[PDB]
């Protein structure tokens, strides 16, 4: 969720250039951003982010049932650029932004905006209303070409803030061996007993509901061998743009 990165990464872009959602949102899937080539001081412009996916896809929801995807994004602007105020947003633009609430990544970072989770059917392309700064009123903003970075995610992530896996990832055998028993559970899920004949050790790997097994009793499994399908139909991607803050003369 945008809140898990905000709660524990102070800045969303790491030194490698990867945005921190990729730490738990593990599949890669394309993101796009259109931004005007150039903008004038103190004018509103739109940055439109596309987070595309095949919409007949159903993911495994937190309780085993299958459902639709939700989308979220993090937009990293230059310092000085910020969310356009309501009075400066046009009516033709206010129906375009639906009724999204863009939040600041942290109150002091006015130039990093997050939005989501919002339903994917409705918001696969999102319009962020940005106000361009004015050099004459800000001594560190110049007429220059500026980088803009976006991260876009659709679907539930794989790892939670404490390091726990969710049920929207592969479950791997914690031991090699032969499966001696597979107990299909009452309300869903499985209990798999592995006899690691090599270590004379018995281990039981538990599998959550919404996942289907790739293994049979009597089969030899290796350590970390996938025991289930990969149920993840979503993914995170990132992209970048360059904008020219333009002198109103030449
Ligand atoms: C790990 C600590 C994570 C970070 C950092 C981010 N996300 Fe995440 N996200 C994570 C999990 C485990 C889940 C699933 C929660 C559940 O049980 O359902 C999510 C979910 C989302 C969603 C909703 C998906 C849906 O309902 O279909 C979105 C839109 C989402 N996350 C976006 C997102 C973005 C853009 C992030 C970077 C700023 C981000 N997440 C970070 C785990 C983690």
Residue owning the nearest CA to atom 1 of ligand 1 = 24
Is the beta carbon of 58 within 6 A of some atom in ligand 1? Answer: no
The residues that bridge with 149 in the sheet, in sequence order, are 76, 240
Parse the chain into domains and list their residue ranges.
1-170+230-250, 171-229
| CA-based radius of gyration for the chain | 23
Q: Can you tell me which atom of ligand 1 is nearest the CA of 161? A: 2
Q: Can you tell me which atom of ligand 1 is nearest the CA of 116? A: 29
Q: Which residues contact 82 (CB under 8 A, 6 or more apart)?
A: 110, 111, 130, 131
Which among 86, 74, 100 has a CA at the least distance from the CA of 131?
86
Q: Which residues contact 77 (CB under 8 A, 6 or more apart)?
A: 111, 112, 113, 130, 148
171 is known to lie in a ligand binding site? no
Residue 175 contacts residue 220 (beta carbons within 8 Å) = no
The residues that bridge with 103 in the sheet, in sequence order, are 114
Is the beta carbon of 160 within 6 A of some atom in ligand 1? Answer: yes
Kindly report the CATH number that applies to the domain delimited by 171-229: 2.40.50.100
* CB-based burial, 168-186: b 16+ in 10 Å, e otherwise: bbbbebebbbebeebeeee
Reading the block at residue 194, the tokens are: 């592995």
- The domain at 1-170+230-250 falls in which architecture? Sandwich (2.60)
Is the beta carbon of 226 within 6 A of some atom in ligand 1? Answer: no
Q: Which residues contact 245 (CB under 8 A, 6 or more apart)?
A: 38, 39, 41, 132, 133, 135, 141, 142, 143, 144, 146
Q: What is the 3-state secondary structure (H, E, C) of the chain?
A: CHHHHHHHCCCCECCCCCEHHHHCCCCECCCEEECCCEECCCCEEEEEEECCCCCCCCEECCCCCEECCEEEEEEECCCCCEECCHHHCCHHHHCCCCCCCCEEEECCEEEEEEEEEEEHHHHCEEEEEEECCCHHHCCCCCCCEEEEEEEEEECCCCECCCCCECCCCCCECCCCEEEEEEEECCCCCEEEEEEECCCCEEEEEEECCCCCECCCCCCEECCCCECECCCCCCEEEEEEEEEEECCCCC
1 is known to lie in a ligand binding site? yes
Resolution in Å equals: 2.3
Residue 234 contacts residue 27 (beta carbons within 8 Å) = yes
Is the beta carbon of 20 within 6 A of some atom in ligand 1? Answer: yes
- Give the determination technique: X-ray
Cα–Cα separations (whole angstroms), residue 237 to 29, 46, 149 = 5, 20, 11
């Amino acid at each position: 969720y945008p809140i898990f990165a905000q709660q524990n990464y102070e800045n969303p872009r790491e030194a490698t250039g990867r945005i921190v959602c990729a730490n738990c949102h593990l599949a890669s899937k394309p993101v796009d951003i259109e931004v005007p080539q150039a903008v004038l001081p103190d004018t509103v412009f739109e940055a439109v982010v596309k987070i595309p996916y095949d919409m007949q896809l159903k993911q495994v929801l937190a309780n085993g049932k299958k459902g639709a995807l939700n989308v979220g994004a993090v937009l990293i602007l230059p310092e000085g650029f910020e969310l356009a105020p309501p009075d400066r947003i046009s009516p033709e633009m206010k129906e375009k932004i639906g009724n999204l609430s863009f939040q600041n990544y942290r109150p002091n970072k006015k130039n990093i905006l997050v939005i989501g989770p919002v339903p994917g059917q409705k918001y696969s392309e999102i319009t962020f209303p940005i106000l361009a700064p004015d050099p004459a009123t800000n001594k560190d903003v110049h007429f220059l070409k500026y980088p803009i970075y976006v991260g876009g995610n659709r679907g539930r992530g794989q790892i939670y803030p404490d390091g726990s896996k969710s049920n929207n990832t592969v479950y791997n055998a914690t031991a090699g061996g032969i499966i001696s028993k597979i107990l299909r559970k009452e309300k869903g899920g499985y209990e798999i007993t592995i006899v690691d004949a090599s270590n004379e050790r018995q281990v039981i790997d538990i599998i959550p509901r919404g996942l289907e097994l790739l293994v049979s009793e009597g089969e030899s499994i290796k350590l970390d061998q996938p025991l289930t399908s990969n149920p993840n139909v979503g993914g995170f991607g990132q992209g970048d743009a360059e904008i020219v803050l333009q002198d109103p003369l030449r």
